[PDB]
CSV table of C-alpha atoms and ligand atoms in Angstrom, one decimal:
chain,number,residue,atom,x,y,z
A,1,UNK,CA,-3.1,-4.4,-20.6
A,2,UNK,CA,-1.2,-7.2,-18.8
A,3,UNK,CA,-3.2,-8.6,-15.9
A,4,UNK,CA,-7.0,-8.0,-16.5
A,5,UNK,CA,-10.1,-10.0,-15.9
A,6,UNK,CA,-13.6,-10.2,-17.5
A,7,UNK,CA,-13.5,-9.4,-21.2
A,8,UNK,CA,-10.5,-7.7,-22.8
A,9,UNK,CA,-9.9,-4.0,-23.3
A,10,UNK,CA,-11.2,-1.7,-26.1
A,11,UNK,CA,-8.7,0.9,-27.3
A,12,UNK,CA,-8.1,2.5,-30.7
A,13,UNK,CA,-6.8,6.0,-30.6
A,14,UNK,CA,-3.1,5.4,-30.5
A,15,UNK,CA,-0.9,8.4,-26.0
A,16,UNK,CA,0.8,7.4,-22.7
A,17,UNK,CA,-1.2,7.0,-19.6
A,18,UNK,CA,-1.5,10.1,-17.4
A,19,UNK,CA,-1.2,10.2,-13.7
A,20,UNK,CA,-4.1,12.2,-12.2
A,21,UNK,CA,-5.0,12.9,-8.5
A,22,UNK,CA,-7.9,10.5,-8.9
A,23,UNK,CA,-5.6,7.9,-10.5
A,24,UNK,CA,-4.3,6.8,-13.9
A,25,UNK,CA,-6.1,7.8,-17.1
A,26,UNK,CA,-6.1,6.6,-20.7
A,27,UNK,CA,-7.7,8.3,-23.7
A,28,UNK,CA,-6.9,11.8,-22.5
A,29,UNK,CA,-4.6,14.6,-23.4
A,30,UNK,CA,-2.7,16.9,-21.0
A,31,UNK,CA,-4.1,20.5,-21.1
A,32,UNK,CA,-3.8,23.2,-18.5
A,33,UNK,CA,-7.3,24.7,-19.2
A,34,UNK,CA,-10.0,25.9,-16.8
A,35,UNK,CA,-13.7,25.6,-17.3
A,36,UNK,CA,-16.3,26.7,-14.8
A,37,UNK,CA,-19.3,24.9,-16.1
A,38,UNK,CA,-18.4,21.3,-16.9
A,39,UNK,CA,-21.4,19.3,-18.1
A,40,UNK,CA,-19.6,16.1,-17.3
A,41,UNK,CA,-17.1,16.8,-14.5
A,42,UNK,CA,-14.6,13.9,-14.3
B,1,UNK,CA,-5.9,26.1,3.2
B,2,UNK,CA,-7.9,24.3,5.6
B,3,UNK,CA,-9.1,26.7,8.2
B,4,UNK,CA,-7.8,26.2,11.7
B,5,UNK,CA,-11.3,25.8,13.1
B,6,UNK,CA,-11.9,23.1,10.5
B,7,UNK,CA,-8.5,21.8,11.1
B,8,UNK,CA,-9.5,21.1,14.7
B,9,UNK,CA,-12.9,19.9,13.6
B,10,UNK,CA,-11.3,17.4,11.1
B,11,UNK,CA,-8.5,16.2,13.3
B,12,UNK,CA,-10.6,15.8,16.5
B,13,UNK,CA,-13.3,13.6,14.8
B,14,UNK,CA,-12.3,10.0,13.8
B,15,UNK,CA,-11.8,10.1,10.1
B,16,UNK,CA,-10.6,7.0,8.1
B,17,UNK,CA,-9.4,8.3,4.7
B,18,UNK,CA,-10.6,6.4,1.6
B,19,UNK,CA,-7.4,7.0,-0.4
B,20,UNK,CA,-8.0,9.9,-2.8
B,21,UNK,CA,-4.6,9.7,-4.4
B,22,UNK,CA,-2.9,6.3,-4.1
B,23,UNK,CA,-4.9,4.6,-1.3
B,24,UNK,CA,-5.1,1.3,-3.2
B,25,UNK,CA,-1.2,1.4,-3.3
B,26,UNK,CA,-1.3,2.2,0.5
B,27,UNK,CA,-2.6,-1.2,1.2
B,28,UNK,CA,-1.1,-3.3,-1.6
B,29,UNK,CA,2.4,-2.5,-0.4
B,30,UNK,CA,1.8,-1.4,3.2
B,31,UNK,CA,-11.4,-0.3,7.2
B,32,UNK,CA,-10.9,1.0,3.7
B,33,UNK,CA,-8.5,-1.6,2.6
B,34,UNK,CA,-10.9,-4.5,2.5
C,101,LIG,C1,0.6,17.5,-17.4
C,101,LIG,O1,1.9,18.0,-17.5
C,101,LIG,C2,2.5,18.5,-16.3
C,101,LIG,C3,3.9,19.0,-16.7
C,101,LIG,O2,4.1,19.2,-18.1
C,101,LIG,C4,2.6,17.4,-15.3
C,101,LIG,O3,3.1,18.0,-14.1
C,101,LIG,C5,1.2,16.8,-15.1
C,101,LIG,O4,1.2,15.8,-14.1
C,101,LIG,C6,0.6,16.3,-16.4
C,101,LIG,N1,-0.8,15.9,-16.2
C,101,LIG,C7,-1.1,14.6,-16.0
C,101,LIG,C8,-2.6,14.3,-15.8
C,101,LIG,O5,-0.3,13.7,-16.1
C-alpha cells in the first residue's frame, strides 16, 4: 500500500501476497486444485 | 512442448513479447515498454 494513486485501497480479510505467473495477487489462498470448467477464469 | 514446426514458425516471425511474467520489471530495471 506504499506508493498508490487515485483513491486508496479497500482491504478487510486479514494473507501475504502470492506471486502468480500473471503477477502478484491479494485476497487469494494457495491451493493446488484443478477445475475444468471455470465460470470466471482468472 | 512447443512443436518444432511451431518453434520455427514462432522464431522466424518477428514477435515482440508483452511480458507475461515480469515484463514490467524487464523495463523498470533494464515497443511494449512504453
Ligand atoms: C503455492 O505454494 C507453492 C509451494 O508451497 C509455491 O511454489 C507457489 O508459488 C505458491 N503459489 C503462489 C501463487 O504463490
